[PDB]
Amino acid sequence: GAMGSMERASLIQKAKLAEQAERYEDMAAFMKGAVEKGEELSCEERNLLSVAYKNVVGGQRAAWRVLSSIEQKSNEEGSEEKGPEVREYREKVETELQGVCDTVLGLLDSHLIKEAGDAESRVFYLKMKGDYYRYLAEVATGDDKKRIIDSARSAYQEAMDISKKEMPPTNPIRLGLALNFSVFHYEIANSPEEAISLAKTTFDEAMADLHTLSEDSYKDSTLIMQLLRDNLTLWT
Amino acid sequence: GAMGSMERASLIQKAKLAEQAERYEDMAAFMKGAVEKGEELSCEERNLLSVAYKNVVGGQRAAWRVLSSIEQKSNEEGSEEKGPEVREYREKVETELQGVCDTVLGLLDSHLIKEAGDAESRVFYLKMKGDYYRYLAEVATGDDKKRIIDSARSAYQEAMDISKKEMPPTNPIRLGLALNFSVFHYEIANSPEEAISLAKTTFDEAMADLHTLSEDSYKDSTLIMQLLRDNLTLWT
Amino acid sequence: QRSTSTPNV
Amino acid sequence: QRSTSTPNV
Ligand SMILES: *CC(=O)NCC1CCN(C(=O)C2(Nc3ccc(Cl)cc3)CCCC2)CC1
Ligand SMILES: *CC(=O)NCC1CCN(C(=O)C2(Nc3ccc(Cl)cc3)CCCC2)CC1
Ligand SMILES: [Cl-]
Ligand SMILES: [Cl-]
Ligand SMILES: [Mg+2]
Ligand SMILES: [Mg+2]
Ligand SMILES: [Mg+2]
Ligand SMILES: [Mg+2]
Ligand SMILES: [Mg+2]
Ligand SMILES: [Mg+2]
């Protein structure tokens, strides 16, 4: 590891600096280094890890979608087929994306998840596991597409089971998990009715628990609830 | 070169794809590969090279400014001095920025400029040379700050001399050169009066030649003239 | 239009 | 506020 010589606290500090500077690849590298120190992550540190990798993979996903669209348009009878370059470059970006997902999944497997015993930590990491299998699913076409989809489903389901037992329905981790699992159902699993049902039940059960929250917690929960509502509006 | 095995035309095509995908580091790598084929660049290809590297260095400059600001605030009596991390990370980004500038300057020196015999090509590359010395100047503090500044000045001046002899005052390359040289004078050389005089004379001489232009050329020229006016408004 | 997942901020 | 140089687009 290129970060093995740097102090854990220095890596975390530099991740925060990288975030300010909008240097998300650096941020991710610093947070990978921090994880590889072998200690459990705090809430704030888990968020740093997530922000970093979400930004990196988000850029890759956006690029892949642009290239895939150009490729699909190129592979038709209308304009012109301009040789192997679009496919080659889409494949390059795809492979880089898959690599990032593999890196995150690797951190989760070695050994964030197995050491995570509190509900907040375990659900957070299982949600992440679902998310990065979902990103793999977005680009999968081969023999393993089904298995990738099932891996995402299984991670999300384990997270859901823990979240329903251990967290209130307004907990932002529980809400974000349900949001993402609902996106999985709609966009990946071809199960829009499951997506809609999950989003609606999640929204309604959260609504009923808002009365228990402080002003600040209310803001946190309702912001995610809005996203559930936005998807329901799109889907229905 | 990692791009040595790829066809020139494929590199150019992939640079265009990378631009669409907002993958500017890839775009720059593809264009570096194209330059290293040893053939002169067309107008469109020169623009691709410029767009790619401007975006890469622009991200670095933005990050460096964020980190420098945090560092300067940290190096005062008010809050707290939090060890070497901000300086270290600012230095890392600085070194990466300097490396990009060195790469571009290297392409220009080996051998874009010496092969560029037409006014449009030669002025374009000399402007680029000025620009990347200017970016080095933005971060320079040591023994060579003066020499870096003079290198930028000398490149811009050679470009100006050719542009005044060979191009109309509305030519977009001539206008962009004058714009950037005026920024050099104001921001780097501590010569705001020179900056203002150059911007005003450039604007006025262009205004007087607009009548010669087609609708499309008028749009090209006036867009850059607006930037001269914006700076003059800021500076006065 | 694509569904919205949990954002960073 | 910083001066404006020639943009990409
Ligand atoms: C304590 C702990 O592990 N907290 C994680 C923290 C929860 C609060 N939070 C959010 O509400 C946003 N992002 C996420 C990210 C992942 C999940 Cl599972 C839930 C929510 C921040 C902006 C959108 C919601 C940050 C992460
Ligand atoms: C033929 C040739 O070399 N053209 C370069 C080309 C000129 C037109 N153009 C522009 O007007 C913008 N960018 C630049 C970039 C560099 C210079 Cl020296 C001048 C103008 C495009 C948006 C801003 C103006 C692109 C480059
Ligand atoms: Cl490629
Ligand atoms: Cl560093
Ligand atoms: Mg230590
Ligand atoms: Mg045809
Ligand atoms: Mg593939
Ligand atoms: Mg060839
Ligand atoms: Mg103090
Ligand atoms: Mg230095």
d(CA A51, CA A35): 14
CB < 8 Å & 24+ apart, contacts of A205-208? A205/A169, A206/A169, A206/A170, A206/A175, A208/A169
d(CA B185, CA B134): 10
CA A156, A162, A166: angle at the middle one, nearest 5?
Answer: 140
**3-class secondary-structure state, position B191:** coil
Residue among A229, A177, A227 nearest A200 (CA): A229
Q: What are phi and psi of A147, to 5 degrees?
A: -65, -40
Interhelix angle for A8-20 vs A24-35, to 10°?
160
Alpha helices (H) in B75-144, listed in sequence order: 85-107, 113-115, 119-139
d(CA B180, CA B159): 11
H-helix or E-strand containing B75? none
CA B184, B189, B193: angle at the middle one, nearest 5?
Answer: 85
The contacts of residue D2 (CB under 8 Å, 6+ apart) are B187
R_g over Cα of chain C: 7
Residue among A166, A160, A169 nearest A129 (CA): A160
In ligand 2, the atom with minimum distance to the C-alpha of B124 is 18
Cis peptide leading into A111, omega within 30 of 0?
A: yes
For A200, B109, B228, the CA distances from A213, given in Å and listed in that order, are 20, 65, 54
- Minimum CA distance residue for ligand 2 atom 25: B47
The contacts of residue B65 (CB under 8 Å, 6+ apart) are none
Cβ neighbours of B47 (radius 10 Å):
15
Residues in chain D: 9
State the DSSP code for A134. Answer: H
d(CA A59, CA B7): 27
CB B125 within 8 A of CB B116: yes
> At A72, which amino acid appears?
Q
DSSP string, A155-188: HHHHHHHHHHHHS-TT-HHHHHHHHHHHHIIIII
d(CA A134, CA A153): 9
Among A48, A124, A218, residue to substitute to test ligand 1 (most atoms within 8 Å of Cβ): A124
In ligand 1, the atom with minimum distance to the C-alpha of A172 is 11
Ligand nearest the Cα atom of residue B9: 8
Alpha helices (H) in chain A, listed in sequence order: 8-20, 24-35, 43-74, 85-107, 113-115, 119-139, 145-166, 172-183, 192-207, 215-235
d(CA B96, CA A14): 16
State the DSSP code for A108. Answer: I
d(CA A43, CA A40): 10
Q: What is the resolution of this structure in A?
A: 1.4
Residue among A135, A3, A162, D9 nearest B89 (CA): A3
Handedness of CA A10, A15, A20, A22 (dihedral sign): positive
H-helix or E-strand containing B174? helix B172-183
State whether B187 and D1 contact (CB < 8 Å). no
Cis peptide leading into B111, omega within 30 of 0?
A: yes
Residue A138 burial (10 A CB sphere; 0-12, 13-18, 19+): middle
Find the chain C residues whose C-beta atoms sit closer than 8 A to any C-beta of A. Answer: 1-9
Phi/psi region, residue B122 (left: phi>0; alpha: psi -120 to 50; beta: rest), is alpha
d(CA A116, CA A97): 26
d(CA A25, CA A57): 10
Widest pairwise Cα distance in chain C:
20
Contact of B19 with chain D, judged by CB distance below 8 Å, is answered with no
d(CA A232, CA A213): 24
State the DSSP code for A78. Answer: S
State whether D3 and B131 contact (CB < 8 Å). no
Query: From ligand 3's centre to the CA of B123, what distance in Å?
Result: 31
Whose tokens are 């794809």? That residue is B17
d(CA A77, CA B177): 44
Residue among A162, A111, A155 nearest A131 (CA): A155
Q: Which protein residues are within 6 Å of ligand 2, measured from CB?
A: B 43, 46-47, 50, 120, 124, 127, 172-173, 176-177, 220, 224; D 6-7, 9
Task: Find out whether the beta carbon of A176 lies less than 6 Å from any atom of ligand 1.
Answer: yes
The structural domains of chain A, ordered by start, are 8-235 (1.20.190.20)
Residue B119 burial (10 A CB sphere; 0-12, 13-18, 19+): middle
d(CA A175, CA B106): 52
Return the structure tokens found at A23. Answer: 């240097």
R_g over Cα of chain B: 19
d(CA A194, CA A190): 9
Contact of A21 with chain B, judged by CB distance below 8 Å, is answered with yes
DSSP string, A48-64: HHHHHHHHHHHHHHHHH
Method: X-ray
> At A1, which amino acid appears?
G
**3-class secondary-structure state, position B7:** coil
For A62, A186, B37, the CA distances from C2, given in Å and listed in that order, are 12, 10, 41
